[model samples]
Target: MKLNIRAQTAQNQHNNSPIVLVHGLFGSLDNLGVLARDLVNDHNIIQVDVRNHGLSPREPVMNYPAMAQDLVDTLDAQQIDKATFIGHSMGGKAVMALTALAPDRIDKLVAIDIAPVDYHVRRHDEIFAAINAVSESDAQTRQQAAAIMRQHLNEEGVIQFLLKSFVDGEWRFNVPVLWDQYPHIVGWEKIPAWDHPALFIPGGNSPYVSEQYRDDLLAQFPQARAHVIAGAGHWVHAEKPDAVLRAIRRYLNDH
Candidate 1:
């Protein structure tokens, strides 16, 4: 479970406990390049490619519990006792599961644009199909694949974000397995309450965090706070970088 990690620094470290960044489904650590560069000055940032994504090895179990254990194993290998977890979409849920499993290892948690509930949405399948289409079509370059993907995935923004995982030289991440486990990835599992200072940043336009899941969020994270980025969608951090940084900085300074 040794996760592939990339580290960067924009400014001098000030004894900040390393902040680990986890990207969403079909995403690698490079997806957070912008945010990572922005915050690397204030904190030691560890961008991780979760199992089955990026340069990390694919695992049979793509569920949260197994993913959490994998994170624990990564921490052990790195000898990092505790760290703050920052995650997006599916990565957000994985961190939540980790917090529930080993609350002591997590100092603070940030779940960006996701809640503990089943999405029941099949839209990701369309995106997956587009990815498969690209791989199978044997498009000469990433740009060509992007064109084919655009046919299936109508949204330009989503197609762009997903295309970051697609490269010309090598295929990093297991697209087929992710597409196969789309249900389990989008679905949520019931875990015990995790009483920690957790922040849930929801996109105002995204339906991932709704009133229906508020109680569940609070129940799991007693010290949880929800903040919405005015016009952003699921990729809140990317959509509202400064705003997200402001919220996270405040949380780190205050709690």
Candidate 2:
């Protein structure tokens, strides 16, 4: 790993190993805080800020290969021998990549609303421009940042989500670096078949993982099972935490 990552951990009463919580693009470690609150009761939590995200160090390249190794270095730095991984969107792909890069270190994997295949699309250019505007302009307050972002992005929910990283008139994430690595962030390279029991939770309303990708998913994760959250979109955990947790809770205890 070229960069040292940042993580926040919580120990359970039973002293379980840990479950590394990975957030999606434009998100920080706390993006998955909802899951951590519930998961920490039964399992220790390792909430990490991926490279170039949150308080973690930033770099130019943003691909699965480097991101996967970042997790490896992070866990080793924590002196952890093994841990489960739960990643959403881009983070999900990173953990999936980890399966190929460091198989034995992973105990289990739960990829929320993402499949291990190249999307070959550019979904965030507008959002990227919106973020760029905020950093370059005199947007010192959330209200000011929101005003500029509104011109480029239509979703109020997404504007609020992006604002989470904007603090003290600065974006916590590296906008330029992300802009340069946009392709890699959205693209993926399929790994060799993991053959382990991996769970795939896709949103009922999200196109990230549909039946069309079933063959490709199974080809990479032979033992994978799908749990679709009804009426939810890409942020399935945010829209339906109880339901998402229900699936994850059961998966964690299953043999």
Candidate 3:
């Protein structure tokens, strides 16, 4: 799988190990811009548009292992042997898979608003239906697609997020393939034991992480701890950036 990578540095200075920010499902590298920009002054940051999204090549399956391999390949291509891995939602699962595959290559791990368990919810179908509706319609631009998505997805914010994948002068994301691979994307694979510091940030309003997943979470991530952002949902970083930043900063400082 191919990927689009973005690197940012503060005044051309590079921090130790660097930091890799992985976006969630149906998300591009741009999705983490706010967080990346905030840390660039002190940490070298790399944002990746995973396969089948944004400028990356589309694949038929979106399995965690395959996605993890893609990240490993990206690291190999960039000559980055190890770095801090920060992921959200599907991206979080990919990070865990990567740690399982090559534990030595990852420094610290951060999973935002997701747990290492299969999620039964099927929210992607609505987004896929909305995208399909737009593709079949006469809408010729991202703005048009966004407008049409409002009909299927009542959330204006979600519609806006989906529209980011509609790149003008470039092919749109593989929505059909994503729709088919939705199951794999939501499913979780076994997490490997890692001795490094691991942080799980969950939104208070999100069900992805709760008391039920605690035992399973501790079983895989022995050193893992969780932080909850009050009044936040699935998109914790975007919804509560200040709190997220504070938690990350504290982790980095204490670890």
lDDT for each candidate structure: 0.83, 0.89, 0.83
Off by over 4 Å in 2: 2-12
Between prediction 1 and prediction 2, the one with superior lDDT is: 2
Ranking by lDDT: 2, 3, 1
What does the lDDT read for residue 132 in candidate 1?
Answer: 77
* Per-model C-alpha RMSD: 1.6, 1.7, 1.8
Clashes of 2: 0
Give TM-scores for every candidate, taking all chains together and pairing residue i with residue i. Answer: 0.94, 0.95, 0.94
Residue range 139-250, candidate 2, lDDT tens digits? 8999999999999998898899899999999998988888888888888888999988999999999999988888889999999988999999899998899999999988
**Residue pairs with backbone atoms closer than 3 Å in model 1 (clashes):** none
| Candidate 3 segments whose C-alpha is farther than 4 A from its true place | 12-15, 169-171
Ranking by TM-score: 2, 1, 3
- Per-residue CA lDDT of candidate 3, range 125-164, in tens? 7777887888888787887777778889988878877777
Model 1, 4-112: lDDT tens digits are 8987653885877778889998888987777788778888788999989988988767889888887788788888899888899889999999987887788888899
